[PDB]
């Protein structure tokens, strides 16, 4: 595993979080290349992409996804001002992250149709420190864990709801788990 924190590695910005509880390694490999190993974890995230993102890349990710629980893998990122934390899941395992969320519309990319949602987090930690902020979510009806996101398609479709987002912090395509188990291998590009 590497040290939980943020850089680069072979050209790609990374972050790699996790809450102390241990059960969770996270490695850095070629290219836009990173691996999560994880058994019995606490809370974390990893992954790999750009910093700062933008609202027209085209992200590329192919591997393997295996979780054993609560986790997604998602293109993950941020805005500021508006602070947003967003997520355009392309799969989960025990838990799908829009459950009992409010539902903003209905978006097809890259092979599948997406639901929208909007959520808020109240006096959690952030990029700029402890706020409230809302979420925004493009979940896949069609779970895969290699393709394409035309992030466009999700910025856009969320701008028509209403869901306005403010300048991209970091964009990655990032393993999320939740006190759960798993394995995952993703290239980004």
Same mark, same amino acid.
């Given at each position: 595993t590497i040290q939980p924190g943020t850089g680069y590695n072979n050209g790609y910005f990374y972050s790699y979080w996790n809450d102390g509880h241990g059960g969770v390694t996270?490695?850095?490999?070629? #290219?836009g290349q990173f691996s999560v190993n994880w058994s019995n974890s606490?809370? =974390? @995230?990893?992954?790999?992409?750009?910093?700062?993102?933008t609202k027209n890349k085209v992200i590329n990710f192919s591997g $393997?996804?295996?979780?054993?629980?609560?986790?997604?893998?998602? @293109?993950?990122? !941020? $805005?500021?001002?508006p602070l947003i934390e967003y997520y355009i899941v392309e799969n989960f395992g025990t838990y799908n992250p829009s459950t #009992? %969320?409010?539902?903003?519309?209905?978006?097809? &990319?890259?092979? &599948? @149709?997406?639901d929208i949602y909007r959520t808020q987090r109240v006096n959690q930690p952030s990029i700029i420190g402890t706020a409230t902020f809302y979420q925004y979510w493009s979940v896949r009806r069609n779970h895969r864990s290699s393709g394409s996101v035309n992030? %466009?398609?999700? =910025?856009?479709? !969320? %701008?028509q709801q209403g869901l306005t987002l403010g300048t991209m912090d970091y964009q990655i395509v990032a393993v999320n788990g939740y =006190?759960?188990?798993? $394995? %995952?291998?993703?290239?980004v590009s």
């Open positions: 996270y490695t850095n490999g070629p #290219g606490g809370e =974390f @995230v990893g992954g790999k992409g750009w910093q700062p993102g $393997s996804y295996n979780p054993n629980g609560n986790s997604y893998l998602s @293109v993950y990122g !941020w $805005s500021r001002n #009992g %969320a409010t539902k903003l519309g209905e978006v097809t &990319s890259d092979g &599948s @149709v997406y992030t %466009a398609n999700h =910025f856009n479709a !969320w %701008a =006190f759960s188990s798993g $394995s %995952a291998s993703i290239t």
